[PDB]
Structure formats: structure tokens, C-alpha cells
Amino acid sequence: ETADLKSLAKRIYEAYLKNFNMNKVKARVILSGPPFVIHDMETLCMAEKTLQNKEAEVRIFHCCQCTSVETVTELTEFAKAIPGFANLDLNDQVTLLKYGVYEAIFAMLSSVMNKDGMLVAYGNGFITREFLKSLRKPFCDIMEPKFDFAMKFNALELDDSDISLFVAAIICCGDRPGLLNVGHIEKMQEGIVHVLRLHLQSNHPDDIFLFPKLLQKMADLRQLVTEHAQLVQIIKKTESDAALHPLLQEIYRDM
Numbered sequence: 001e002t003a004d005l006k007s008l009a010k011r012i013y014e015a016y017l018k019n020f021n022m023n024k025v026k027a028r029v030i031l032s033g034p035p036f037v038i039h040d041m042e043t044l045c046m047a048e049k050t051l052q053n054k055e056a057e058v059r060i061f062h063c064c065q066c067t068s069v070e071t072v073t074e075l076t077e078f079a080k081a082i083p084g085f086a087n088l089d090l091n092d093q094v095t096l097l098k099y100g101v102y103e104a105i106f107a108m109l110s111s112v113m114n115k116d117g118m119l120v121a122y123g124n125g126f127i128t129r130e131f132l133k134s135l136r137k138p139f140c141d142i143m144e145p146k147f148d149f150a151m152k153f154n155a156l157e158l159d160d161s162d163i164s165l166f167v168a169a170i171i172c173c174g175d176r177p178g179l180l181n182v183g184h185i186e187k188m189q190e191g192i193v194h195v196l197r198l199h200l201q202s203n204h205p206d207d208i209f210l211f212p213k214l215l216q217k218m219a220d221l222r223q224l225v226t227e228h229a230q231l232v233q234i235i236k237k238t239e240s241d242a243a244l245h246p247l248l249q250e251i252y253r254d255m
């Protein structure tokens with residue numbers, strides 16, 4: 001009710017600090033304050049050697065899967081630390097994760113993105129937005145909409161404490177399909193959402209409607225992920241050399 005709100009937020013923020021190697025503050029330091037730039041095929045090959053016979057498109061997106069698999073592993077550890085998450089039924093734990101991970105992945109991805117490109121290889125590399133756009137279809141259509149989301153998400157000027165509470169709220173959506181105990185999850189989300197609002201009002205006193213603007217972003221992420229999943233399916237089925245990591249196969253499966 002105030003001490004309990006500090007306690008909920010503390011545990012979430014700390015689980016974020018603990019579990020995510022890359023975060024907004026670290027990313028903004030590196031994108032400022034120097035990362036190897038990938039802006040063409042020569043620089044790509046240079047980075048691959050330092051940071052297969054397959055197409056350039058195939059290699060880039062093979063490496064992405066390694067990054068996303070690490071993030072899904074990190075988000076899982078973060079979820080287990082959200083107060084209440086671990087007392088959930090087991091079917092609900094994996095359901096919340098299956099549906100929540102990519103929404104949370106793309107919200108957090110924004111921290112490493114600017115209008116010109118994004119960090120790769122733990123912030124040791126920077127891959128250009130224009131190089132990504134120069135890939136042949138459908139590979140050039142993968143990242144562009146995430147840059148588009150990210151430019152608008154980054155304009156909200158969130159920091160890591162905001163983001164941590166946001167991500168916990170994404171993970172605890174009571175409206176995931178197949179959920180068995182929606183009432184307990186919904187009680188979890190309400191506290192997170194309530195402390196997020198209060199945190200946003202004190203942290204950002206000049207952005208009146210930051211709370212609702214950020215909630216609109218959940219709907220945008222949900223849309224961004226449904227579209228990404230469709231595109232992953234399409235590439236998987238049309239583009240032979242596009243294997244999918246076995247952890248990702250099951251996430252995408254019943255989406």
C-alpha cells in the first residue's frame with residue numbers, strides 16, 4: 001500500500017539489473033560517450049570473422065536467433081523473480097512466457113536502436129538500418145518495422161526503471177489464451193500497473209499522459225509481434241536455408 005509498492009518495484013527493478021546484460025543506460029553510453037560498423041558485405045564478413053557458405057541474409061538472421069535465444073533465457077529468469085510469478089500454476093508460467101517474450105524482446109530492443117541502426121554482438125558492433133533495408137525480400141522487411149516502433153517508443157524517453165516495470169506488466173497479461181488462473185495473474189498485473197503509473201508520474205512530471213501513451217504501446221507490440229511471427233513462418237517455409245533454433249520453434253508454434 002506504499003511500503004508494499006516500494007517492495008514490488010524494488011524486486012522487479014533488481015531482477016532487471018540482475019538479469020539483463022544489455023540495458024538502456026549501457027546502450028546509450030556506447031551509442032555515445034567504439035562499435036564496429038556493419039554497413040555492407042565486406043564489413044559483415046569482417047565482423048563474422050571477429051565478433052558459413054550461406055547467403056548474407058541467412059547468416060545475419062542466424063546470428064539474430066542466437067541473440068533472441070539469450071534474451072528469452074534472460075526474460076525467463078526475470079519472470080521467475082516477479083513477485084507472484086513463481087506461485088503460478090506451471091501451465092500459466094510457460095503460457096505467460098510464450099506469449100510475452102517477443103513483446104518484451106522488442107520493447108527492450110528499442111534501447112539499442114537509433115534512427116540509423118542498432119547494436120549487435122553485446123554492443124561491440126553496430127549494424128546499419130540502411131544495410132538491413134538493402135537486403136533482398138523478405139529479409140529487408142524484418143527489422144524496418146522494429147525501427148519504426150523503436151523511434152516512437154524511444155521518443156517517450158523511458159529509462160531502465162520504467163522499462164523494467166513495463167516488461168513485468170507485459171509478462172503478466174491476464175488475457176493470454178489458454179490461461180488457467182486469470183484472476184491471480186490479473187491481481188499481479190494490477191499492482192505492477194499501479195506502481196508503474198505512480199512511478200511514471202514522479203519520474204516524468206512533465207509528460208502528463210505518459211502512462212496511457214506507454215499502455216498504447218502494449219497494443220502496438222502485440223501487433224508488431226503477430227506480424228513478425230507471420231513473417232518468420234513465411235521465411236521458414238519459402239527460404240530453405242532458414243533453420244529455426246529449437247527453442248524458438250516452440251515459441252512460434254502455437255502463436
Ligand SMILES: COc1ccc(N2C(=O)[C@@H](Cc3cccc(OCCc4nc(-c5ccccc5)oc4C)c3)[C@H]2C(=O)O)cc1
Pocket residue numbers: 047048059060061063064065067068069071105109118119120121127142143232235236242243244248
Ligand atoms: C526462419 O527465419 C527467421 C527469420 C528471422 C528470425 N529472427 C529475427 O529477425 C530475430 C528477432 C530478433 C530478436 C532479438 C534481437 C534481434 O536483433 C538483434 C540485432 C542484430 N544483430 C545482428 C547481427 C548481425 C551480424 C552478426 C551478429 C549479429 O543483426 C541484427 C539485426 C532480432 C529472430 C527471431 O524471430 O527470434 C528468426 C527466424
